[PDB]
């Protein structure tokens, strides 16, 4: 759907 | 302001986009046929012409104008005719949106390699092709 | 051909109403193509020969004056002419009032036409000094008459593609400081609507991202197992309509760029990209505005 979900793993 | 808005139909778009044309009655229709024909014409004689340095390229240029003006016309003038075919063969589940476009494309094949050659009225000759383009397209669509 | 994501246009709040300070009304008829917009207009070199725009308009008002004047006089003389004749003709008083009126009616038609055309020129002087961004012309006919007459200043498209170029070229620091200045101030009534797009424009600031991705230019696919596929006794395909779906927007698309490729008017193509975006909505969306696909 667009909405780029990161994971920020720091 | 931040009030909400009811949506609109995209057919009675298209309605209010057409409410433009008026039919010619199928008697001037061979002088747009005729004009057209000469737009053709001083464009490939333009192509060829491209080496003379010709003071006058504006009389080729007026009958470039004038050819495109008159295709521009005859196509708008069918607009109601595909559209009305289209809704003729609806309820196959298939959107109305979608049939028009179809009519419309093989209108556009179709007046664009036509001639009259002393032809009869060119609605028969639409009508028959946007047909076929349309059975195609419900065909394929399977 | 750009698109809107539906999630916004139609939103409540709708993201774009806030950012883009337009109602919804104008937002939704340009993204169905219903109306033209003016993206930028260079008003300062408008200004350095506003004047001289100001005499030209002066000048071809008397021309059509004058014409107009001719007309008048041509046919007062006519109708004179006539009625000098009947008179010598000794006809009825019957015949005198019947081609008075006629000749009568007749200058009030071409003086009526005259005035059309004069305030034909007022429109179109009123919405070329008095023209900024954001800006709306419902009739097609008014757009046309413009871009003939002035298309040298104000550059205006009906689409995404509109919107994608209007937000690209904005700014948004210059607006929030405007706004906070505003909300320095009082007056509630507007306080409380400038405050909501504050809000809006902050967020976006602080993120640090861009309004350009409220306009997209392709959509990915799920995998194909998140859409698995079925086959039934007979083979049929009963599985998830996600396929239907994807197939109906990968099919407009196709029909889009062979249309492009042969050539056509403007009619079809706007007609096309609307039913694009159409399909793009339903498929990000079914039911969320309109009558949902069954």
């Given at each position: 759907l667009c909405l780029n979900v990161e994971v920020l793993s720091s | 302001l931040d009030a909400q808005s009811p949506a609109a139909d995209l057919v009675r778009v298209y309605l209010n986009g057409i409410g433009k044309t008026a039919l010619?009655?199928?008697?001037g229709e061979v002088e747009l046929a005729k004009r057209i024909e000469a737009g053709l014409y001083a464009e490939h004689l333009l192509e060829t012409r491209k080496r003379l340095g010709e003071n006058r390229k504006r009389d080729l240029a007026a009958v470039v104008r004038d050819g495109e003006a008159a295709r521009r016309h005859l196509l708008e003038a069918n607009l109601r005719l595909v559209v009305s075919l289209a809704k003729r063969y609806?309820?196959?589940?298939?959107?109305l949106l979608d049939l028009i476009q179809e009519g419309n494309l093989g209108l556009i094949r179709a007046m664009e390699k036509?001639?009259?050659?002393?032809?009869?009225?060119f609605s028969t000759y639409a009508t028959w092709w946007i047909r076929q383009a349309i059975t195609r397209g419900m065909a394929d669509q399977s | 051909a750009p698109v809107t994501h539906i999630?916004?246009?139609?939103?409540?709040?709708?993201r774009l109403g806030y950012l883009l300070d337009l109602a919804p009304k104008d937002l939704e008829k340009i993204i169905y193509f219903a109306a033209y917009v003016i993206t930028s207009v260079d008003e300062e070199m408008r200004h350095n020969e506003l004047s001289t725009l100001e005499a030209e308009m002066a000048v071809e008002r008397k021309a059509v004056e004058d014409q107009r004047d001719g007309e008048l006089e041509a046919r007062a003389q006519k109708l004179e002419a006539d009625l000098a004749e009947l008179e010598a003709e000794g006809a009825k008083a019957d015949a005198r009032r019947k081609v008075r009126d006629g000749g009568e009616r007749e200058m009030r038609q071409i003086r009526d036409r005259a005035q059309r055309e004069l305030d034909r020129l007022e429109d179109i002087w009123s919405t070329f000094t008095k023209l900024a961004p954001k800006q709306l012309i419902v009739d097609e006919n008014l757009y046309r008459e413009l871009v003939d007459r002035?298309?040298?200043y104000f550059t205006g498209a009906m689409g995404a593609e509109s919107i994608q170029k209007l937000i690209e070229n904005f700014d948004i620091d210059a607006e929030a400081e405007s706004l906070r200045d505003v909300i320095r101030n009082?007056?509630?009534?507007?306080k409380l609507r400038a405050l909501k797009r504050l809000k809006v424009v902050a967020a976006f600031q602080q993120s640090?991202?861009?309004?350009?991705?409220?306009?997209?230019d392709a959509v990915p696919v799920i995998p194909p197992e998140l859409r698995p596929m079925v086959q039934l006794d007979?083979?049929?395909?009963?599985?998830?309509?996600l396929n239907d779906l994807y197939r109906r927007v990968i099919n407009r698309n196709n029909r889009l760029k062979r249309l492009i490729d042969l050539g056509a008017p403007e009619i079809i193509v706007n007609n096309e990209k609307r039913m694009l975006q159409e399909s793009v909505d339903a498929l990000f969306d079914?039911?969320?505005?309109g009558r949902p696909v069954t």
């Open positions: - | 010619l009655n199928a008697a609806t309820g196959r589940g298939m959107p036509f001639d009259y050659t002393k032809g009869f009225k | 999630w916004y246009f139609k939103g409540v709040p709708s002035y298309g040298e009082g007056k509630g009534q507007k640090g991202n861009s309004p350009m991705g409220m306009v997209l007979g083979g049929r395909f009963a599985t998830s309509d079914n039911g969320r505005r």
